[PDB]
Write a protein that binds this ligand. Structure first.
Ligand SMILES: [Zn+2]
Lengths: 181, 121, 93, 107, 99, 177, 72
RNA sequence: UUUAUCAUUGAACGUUCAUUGAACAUUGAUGCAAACUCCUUGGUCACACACACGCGGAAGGCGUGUUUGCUGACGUCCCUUGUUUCAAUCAUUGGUUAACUGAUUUUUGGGGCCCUUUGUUCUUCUGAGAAGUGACACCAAUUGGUGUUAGGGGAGCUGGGGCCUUUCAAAAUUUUGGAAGGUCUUGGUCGGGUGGAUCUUAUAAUUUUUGAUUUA
């Protein structure tokens, strides 16, 4: 935002608000002409100050979202980095992770939730909490029902308590009707 | 290009002009010469280097020619592997402007020497 | 002595240059030390063969008379070598 | 004894120049350098029947639209292969070489 | 013949303006004069096919602003050569001009 | 013969390779050097464009808007604030992944800046001569830090916020620490 | 006039590319003001290998470039 | 449209598969265009908007004149800087018979254009005014470095060109040359082991100019 506020401050020839955003939607929603037969000094200054209100409200929305993400979840996540399947992870840590997985599910921005399941899957890697959480997520909400088989294989591929994941893997593939598998 | 290059000018008079110097390979360098030497090592500001490809060369034979340009910017080309240079654009600032600029540069230089004489005291 | 361009090449020491060679190879990397005879020594060199491959030398020393050109960084556009009028502070005695 | 001085007696004279490449050049000499960097205004230059490098070096010099008509070409000395003088010019006048004369009187 | 107006008199002296008008109108006579009275005005002269091409016009100039067409008040000299005596007419016009 | 150093505005009485190397490595030369290059860039950024702005020749100009000038002290103050802020935005990088992967098995080969093998021999060779008076390296394994939350690490740092819009935050966070 | 700065490569295995495809690997025993190069244990690498005798010296015209195969 | 490794061994009918060893990119690459959008520059001048067959800009060529045989370093005053136009008032000066006309300056007001002068303007300060012409601006650690100190107009003086008048000389009323005055236009306000530039000579032998880039 500092880069882009600085960038709004630098623009001065008033024809490159076209390359800022689309000309028509700059007219209809925000009421600035790019073609203007006037002195164009106060017009540009009003233009810049009018655009700073739009960037306020965008900064409000995304600042509220990030202050939420931080204060609820990332203030309680300390370890991100997958040390060595010997090492253990705190209970309050797991308590944050599963809520964060739960949190992103509601956003439905799929790239973010693929990323956050895969991302929590780094230091959680093989506890069979997050893998089962994924598979029961994909079967329930997104409904691919074969991607859950796939990730479920990939966490049979390491999760030291393999019991629950082998049972859930059985059930998923019985639904899949891949019986020869 | 109707540029009408100075009929009695050589390299030192050609300074800050936009050149189109051509090499042994047949590559062309385009840019402001800012300096030369005895061996014709040129610098070339904001230089772009253009080839023709081997395939477009067929169309060049006895027309629109997809020259391939890479952008070399401030380069400093050598006098061994060139062929010949011509002039493509005149410089930005005209002869009066270059002349007044050189006057200001000389006045500032004399002033800096006065400041050296002052600090030496 | 030198003249302006090889003085510039003496100036751009330790900064990311790119060399074409006469073979078509364009080495690129930090410039350890140039000489007056344009033999230039380079470090962290990433090389483009004529065939189209790319490799990574650590420590190259390309001879001057097979340089096609050299590209220095942009800022040396503004260099005190180019100043046409800078007067000499009383040469030594 | 060098013969570049001969060419230095040839400002504002209209020659052709054939290059080591094969480029042929038509247009007056404005000067010539010590090591024969010959600068030439009012060029039109031609390539006889072909060399692909010379084809590129011809087209790319602007104003091609294979006679290329150019206002001003500096040509490097080690590119000039041979240079055809006008036949109107008298060689008996030029080769006298006042420097070589003075050196004969210097001996 | 047809005379066109607002045709950007600072384009060229003689022949490059005849090239720039023929390029944006991509004719056997394009008379343009450097005198101060006829400045932004020109006259092209092909007569019935030229009347058809004048009836085809919406034409803007290569320097910019739109050109207005109009029919010639008398003729061009090339029309009088097409209708061809004429040398005596040129002599009489020159004698009126020097008068 | 004489090698004029344009930065130092001094001479070298007879050019040779060794006095050139020893001068170009010299700290006086590097200081005047760095001053000059910074100086040319701050001149070119400071220098106003001032184009010709060829004004064309032209009913619908009925609306009139008020310009906003400032005081000369107010001008100089806001320009100084913008100078400091440009200088911040250019210099600042983002740490995070250093502070994120602090405990990692191979953090101390990869992010510790000259154990990377690729840029690695540089920072040993780019080390200056240390003639005046007065590393977490590859030895680190997994069993160095077994359990990172035993010995307390500092929390993840709270994200940064524009002070221009610091007044418009959510007042009263849910869930006090 | 100036003798080249191959002093860092004084005993380290270098790889000349000679001429455009010749690639010779040796140890830099010597250099003169022309980059004529005395190599020891030259072992010409074709992309097959061929050894080149005990000592060798290579023309500083033919030499295009050289890489330090040994660490410095 | 084309292309996306080789070698050895085994098996099946040159191909396919498997194993072993060695060494960017297909959404590319190449060709053909076509369209949209965007970018930077320019006298968007002055005049005029009409029926022929203008000054100051920018780049080059030619001519004349001056000066020097390389160059430069080392050992004026005043007004204004948003501009332009119109009316009124007042002052001065000239002419004609206190009146009139013209010019200039000051003030007030209106109209147009412009304020991207983007920091609302050569620098600083104040919200157009005030001050100045070593100072200011700024980056590093008082020191060091870079940039800026402007633009326009008028006068004095000086340089050049053009015209006119007078005088003197020469040649056969005319031509040429010199001087002076007036008018117009444009411009300005001696030394040195010093360095730099150009050209010679080392220097036609591997590093740029005395050839290994017409691919045979
Ligand atoms: Zn220095």
């Amino acid at each position: 935002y500092a880069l882009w506020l600085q960038r709004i401050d630098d623009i001065m020839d008033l024809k490159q608000l076209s390359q800022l955003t689309s000309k028509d939607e700059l007219l209809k929603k925000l009421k600035i002409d790019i073609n203007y037969s006037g002195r164009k000094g106060p017009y540009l200054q009003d233009a810049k100050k009018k655009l700073k209100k739009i960037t306020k409200e965008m900064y409000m929305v995304v600042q509220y979202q990030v202050l939420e993400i931080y204060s609820i979840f990332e203030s309680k996540i300390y370890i991100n980095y997958y040390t060595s399947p010997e090492t253990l992870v705190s209970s309050d840590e797991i308590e944050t992770w599963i809520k964060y997985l739960d949190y992103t599910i509601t956003l439905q921005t799929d790239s973010l939730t693929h990323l956050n399941f895969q991302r929590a899957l780094l230091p959680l890697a093989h506890y069979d909490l997050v893998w089962i959480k994924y598979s029961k997520w994909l079967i329930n909400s997104k409904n691919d029902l074969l991607g859950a088989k796939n990730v479920l294989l990939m966490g049979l591929k390491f999760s030291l308590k393999k019991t629950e994941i082998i049972k859930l893997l059985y059930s998923v593939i019985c639904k899949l009707n891949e019986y020869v598998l | 290009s109707k540029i009408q290059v100075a009929h009695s000018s050589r390299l030192a008079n050609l300074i800050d002009y936009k050149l189109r110097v051509l090499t042994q390979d047949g590559r062309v360098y385009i840019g402001q010469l800012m300096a030369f030497d005895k061996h014709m090592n040129l610098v070339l500001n904001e230089c772009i280097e253009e080839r023709v490809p081997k395939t477009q060369l067929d169309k060049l034979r006895p027309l629109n020619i997809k020259v391939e340009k890479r952008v070399l910017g401030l380069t400093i080309l050598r006098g061994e592997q060139i062929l010949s240079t011509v002039v493509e654009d005149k410089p930005l600032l005209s002869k009066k402007e270059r002349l007044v600029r050189d006057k200001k540069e000389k006045k500032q230089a004399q002033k800096q020497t006065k400041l050296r004489k002052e600090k030496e005291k | 002595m030198n003249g302006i361009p090889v003085k510039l090449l003496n100036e751009a020491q330790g900064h990311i240059v790119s060399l074409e060679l006469t073979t078509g190879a364009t080495y690129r990397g930090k410039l350890v030390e140039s000489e007056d005879s344009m033999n230039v020594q380079l470090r962290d060199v990433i090389a483009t063969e004529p065939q189209g491959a790319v490799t990574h030398m650590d420590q190259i020393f390309v001879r001057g008379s097979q340089i096609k050109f050299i590209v220095v960084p942009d800022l040396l556009k503004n260099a005190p070598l180019f100043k046409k009028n800078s007067s000499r502070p009383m040469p030594p005695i | 004894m060098k013969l570049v001085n001969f060419l230095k007696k040839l400002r504002n004279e209209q020659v052709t120049i054939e290059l080591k490449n094969g480029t042929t050049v038509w247009g007056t000499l404005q000067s010539v350098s010590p090591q024969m960097n010959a600068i030439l205004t009012d060029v039109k230059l031609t390539l006889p029947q072909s060399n692909g490098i010379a084809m590129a070096s011809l087209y790319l010099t602007g104003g091609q639209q294979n006679i290329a008509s150019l206002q001003y070409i500096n040509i490097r000395g080690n590119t000039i292969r041979q240079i055809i003088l006008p036949d109107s010019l008298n060689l008996d006048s030029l080769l006298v070489d006042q420097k070589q004369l003075n050196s004969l009187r210097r001996s | 013949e047809n005379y066109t107006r607002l045709l950007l008199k600072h384009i060229n002296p003689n022949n490059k303006y005849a090239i720039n008008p023929s390029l944006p109108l991509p004719l056997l006579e394009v008379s343009i004069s450097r005198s101060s009275k006829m400045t932004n005005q020109a006259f092209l002269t092909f007569q019935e096919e030229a009347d058809r091409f004048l009836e085809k016009y919406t034409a803007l100039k290569v320097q910019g602003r739109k050109v207005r067409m109009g029919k010639a008040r008398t003729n061009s000299l090339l029309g009088x050569x097409x209708x061809x005596x004429x040398x005596x007419x040129x002599x009489x016009x020159x004698x009126x001009x020097x008068x | 013969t004489r090698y004029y150093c344009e930065y130092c505005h001094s001479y070298l009485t007879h050019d040779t390779l060794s006095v050139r190397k020893s001068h170009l490595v010299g700290k006086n030369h590097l200081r005047i050097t760095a001053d000059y290059y910074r100086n040319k860039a701050r001149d070119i950024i400071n220098k106003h464009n001032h184009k010709r702005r060829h004004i064309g020749k032209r009913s619908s100009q009925n609306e009139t808007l008020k310009v906003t000038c400032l005081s000369n002290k107010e001008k100089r103050h806001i320009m100084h604030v913008k100078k400091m802020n440009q200088k911040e935005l250019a210099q600042t990088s983002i740490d995070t992944l250093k502070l994120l992967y602090d405990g990692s098995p191979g953090y101390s080969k990869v992010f510790v800046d000259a154990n990377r093998f690729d840029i690695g021999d540089l920072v040993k060779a780019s080390k200056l001569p240390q003639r005046a008076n007065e590393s977490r390296s590859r030895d680190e394994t997994c069993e160095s830090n077994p359990f990172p939350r035993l010995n307390n690490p500092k929390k993840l740092e709270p994200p940064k916020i524009l002070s221009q819009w610091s007044n418009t935050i959510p007042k009263t966070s849910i869930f006090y620490s | 006039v100036s003798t080249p700065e191959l002093k860092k490569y004084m005993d380290k295995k270098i790889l000349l590319n000679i001429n455009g495809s010749r690639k010779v690997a040796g140890i830099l025993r010597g250099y003169d003001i022309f980059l004529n190069v005395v190599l020891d244990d030259a072992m010409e690498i074709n992309g097959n290998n061929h050894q080149l005798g005990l000592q060798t010296v290579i023309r500083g015209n033919s030499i295009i470039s050289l890489e330090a195969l040994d660490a410095i």
